[PDB]
Amino acid sequence: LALSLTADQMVSALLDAEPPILYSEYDPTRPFSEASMMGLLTNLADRELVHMINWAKRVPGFVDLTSHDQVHLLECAWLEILMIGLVWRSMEHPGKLLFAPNLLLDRNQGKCVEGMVEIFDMLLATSSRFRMMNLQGEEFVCLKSIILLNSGVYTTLKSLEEKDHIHRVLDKITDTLIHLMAKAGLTLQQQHQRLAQLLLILSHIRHMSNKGMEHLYSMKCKNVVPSYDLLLEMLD
Amino acid sequence: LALSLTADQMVSALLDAEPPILYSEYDPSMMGLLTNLADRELVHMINWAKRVPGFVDLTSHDQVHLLECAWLEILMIGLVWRSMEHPGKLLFAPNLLLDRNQGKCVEGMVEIFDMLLATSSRFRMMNLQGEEFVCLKSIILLNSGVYTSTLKSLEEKDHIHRVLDKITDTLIHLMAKAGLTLQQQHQRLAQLLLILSHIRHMSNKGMEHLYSMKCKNVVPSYDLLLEMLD
Numbered sequence: 335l336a337l338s339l340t341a342d343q344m345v346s347a348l349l350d351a352e353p354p355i356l357y358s359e360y361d362p363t364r365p366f367s368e369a370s371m372m373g374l375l376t377n378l379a380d381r382e383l384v385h386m387i388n389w390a391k392r393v394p395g396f397v398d399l400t401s402h403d404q405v406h407l408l409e410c411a412w413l414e415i416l417m418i419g420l421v422w423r424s425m426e427h428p429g430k431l432l433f434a435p436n437l438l439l440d441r442n443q444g445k446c447v448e449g450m451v452e453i454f455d456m457l458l459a460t461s462s463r464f465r466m467m468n469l470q471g472e473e474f475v476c477l478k479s480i481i482l483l484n485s486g487v488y489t490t491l492k493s494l495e496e497k498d499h500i501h502r503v504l505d506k507i508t509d510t511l512i513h514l515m516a517k518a519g520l521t522l523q524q525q526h527q528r529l530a531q532l533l534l535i536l537s538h539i540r541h542m543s544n545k546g547m548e549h550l551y552s553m554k555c556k557n558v559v560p561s562y563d564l565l566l567e568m569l570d
Numbered sequence: 571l572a573l574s575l576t577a578d579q580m581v582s583a584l585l586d587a588e589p590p591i592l593y594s595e596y597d598p599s600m601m602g603l604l605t606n607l608a609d610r611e612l613v614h615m616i617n618w619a620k621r622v623p624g625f626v627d628l629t630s631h632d633q634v635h636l637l638e639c640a641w642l643e644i645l646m647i648g649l650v651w652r653s654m655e656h657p658g659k660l661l662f663a664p665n666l667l668l669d670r671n672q673g674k675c676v677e678g679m680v681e682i683f684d685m686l687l688a689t690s691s692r693f694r695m696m697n698l699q700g701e702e703f704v705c706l707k708s709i710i711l712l713n714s715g716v717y718t719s720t721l722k723s724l725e726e727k728d729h730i731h732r733v734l735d736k737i738t739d740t741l742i743h744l745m746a747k748a749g750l751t752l753q754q755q756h757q758r759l760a761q762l763l764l765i766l767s768h769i770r771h772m773s774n775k776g777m778e779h780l781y782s783m784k785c786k787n788v789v790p791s792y793d794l795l796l797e798m799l800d
């Protein structure tokens with residue numbers, strides 16, 4: 335299946351696959367220490383991962399890949415997905431990050447953790463960028479799907495078949511995005527322009543994830559990347 | 571200024587801005603040759619930048635910032651372009667074609683090499699054209715350090731996004747004249763722009779790889795950049 339859908343079926347399939355908004359532990363001794371805050375954020379991210387995989391498996395064409403490739407895609411994209419999710423729910427809160435409804439953090443508190451405020455500022459500018467573009471929910475949900483499939487599709491006859499499949503679904507998601515823009519009343523020109531502006535944003539988000547990884551590795555954190563087994567286990 | 575140009579005038583201007591292909595100063599250390607080569611490519615990269623439609627409409631500090639963020643990506647998409655027609659190899663210079671096996675001589679590099687070779691295959695499979703390539707490089711210059719507060723800064727970011735809108739039209743136009751449908755047009759546009767994300771990934775991996783060894787400084791200096799822009 336997965337290539338039969340209309341654009342409208344694609345949006346709906348993606349909208350219902352959407353993960354829930356999770357909460358931080360309701361037990362914080364606010365104000366924070368650098369360790370307490372990294373503890374709450376880490377705990378949150380760990381719980382978001384399980385819903386992320388479940389979401390991934392409901393993304394059109396994702397379960398058609400081999401389990402090994404599914405793991406590979408998730409290995410590359412997991413932090414990017416976290417980040418575009420974070421910036422999305424932070425849109426209506428300028429100068430703040432909404433990790434959880436009970437964990438809205440301003441810029442000054444990011445500076446509690448060494449080097450995080452640098453990572454923090456990139457995230458805010460991106461949220462602001464989404465706000466100025468008036469990014470819509472269907473567009474976001476599409477952009478997130480693109481990140482999942484694209485971040486690792488740069489890695490046999492089987493192997494080329496899996497990649498052309500991935501590129502087939504991505505062209506469909508591209509079709510879906512254009513369709514959404516057409517019914518909004520944008521011209522052929524505004525359609526190509528807006529599509530471009532959205533994808534150029536993914537480039538920066540890739541940069542943010544890259545910086546984020548170094549920051550996490552810089553806090554000498556315990557076991558940053560999810561491991562092949564944990565990803566494989568959660569996928570079954 | 572540049573917001574007035576047609577797609578074909580945009581392409582023509584960018585094709586004429588293209589830097590020369592430089593040579594490795596070889597013999598008849600490998601990091602020595604590559605470092606030396608990259609250093610000489612930088613001056614022409616700046617000359618190229620100043621001739622990209624709308625780059626000189628910006629302030630010098632803003633030009634420096636863009637070049638500060640994009641320089642390694644530009645080097646890399648340049649390398650991948652001239653390596654396209656040489657499978658399993660990357661052409662740093664006409665007298666310096668290297669396989670993965672020779673990249674594996676230098677520590678931690680074989681990973682970056684594989685990423686770069688992978689980009690070449692992708693360009694090759696897409697039949698990426700010189701005109702498209704030349705458009706993609708300009709986008710890298712303008713887009714990589716745009717996300718970064720006076721009224722002037724706001725005008726700067728609006729100009730950059732207007733010029734970026736222009737190259738999108740330019741890219742779409744090229745695809746139309748090649749005979750692709752409207753649907754094939756936005757698909758290829760998407761495919762090209764999504765590749766830029768990977769190049770950003772390579773660029774960051776590249777920096778970490780460069781810091782893992784020595785340099786005088788890895789990032790070019792603000793003054794030198796401001797100096798080179800003259």
Ligand SMILES: Cc1c(-c2ccc(O)cc2)n(Cc2ccc(OCCN3CCCCCC3)cc2)c2ccc(O)cc12
Pocket residue numbers: 375376377378379380382383416417419420433450453545546547549550556557558559560561
């Ligand atoms: C973007 C983001 C981060 C993050 C990003 C960059 C940083 O420098 C710091 C935090 N954080 C906090 C954070 C991000 C990543 C973390 O990795 C910790 C370990 N877990 C990864 C999921 C589990 C198996 C692997 C290890 C731990 C905490 C988020 C939490 C929720 C969320 O929606 C978004 C984020």
Ligand SMILES: Cc1c(-c2ccc(O)cc2)n(Cc2ccc(OCCN3CCCCCC3)cc2)c2ccc(O)cc12
Pocket residue numbers: 604605607608609611612645646648649662678679682683686776779780785787788789790791
């Ligand atoms: C892709 C690529 C590399 C490269 C270097 C290190 C890696 O780990 C992977 C690829 N290199 C070699 C190289 C690239 C960048 C380098 O940066 C450090 C040295 N001088 C760098 C530039 C600003 C002025 C000061 C620093 C040093 C070596 C290329 C050279 C030319 C070229 O067209 C492409 C490349």
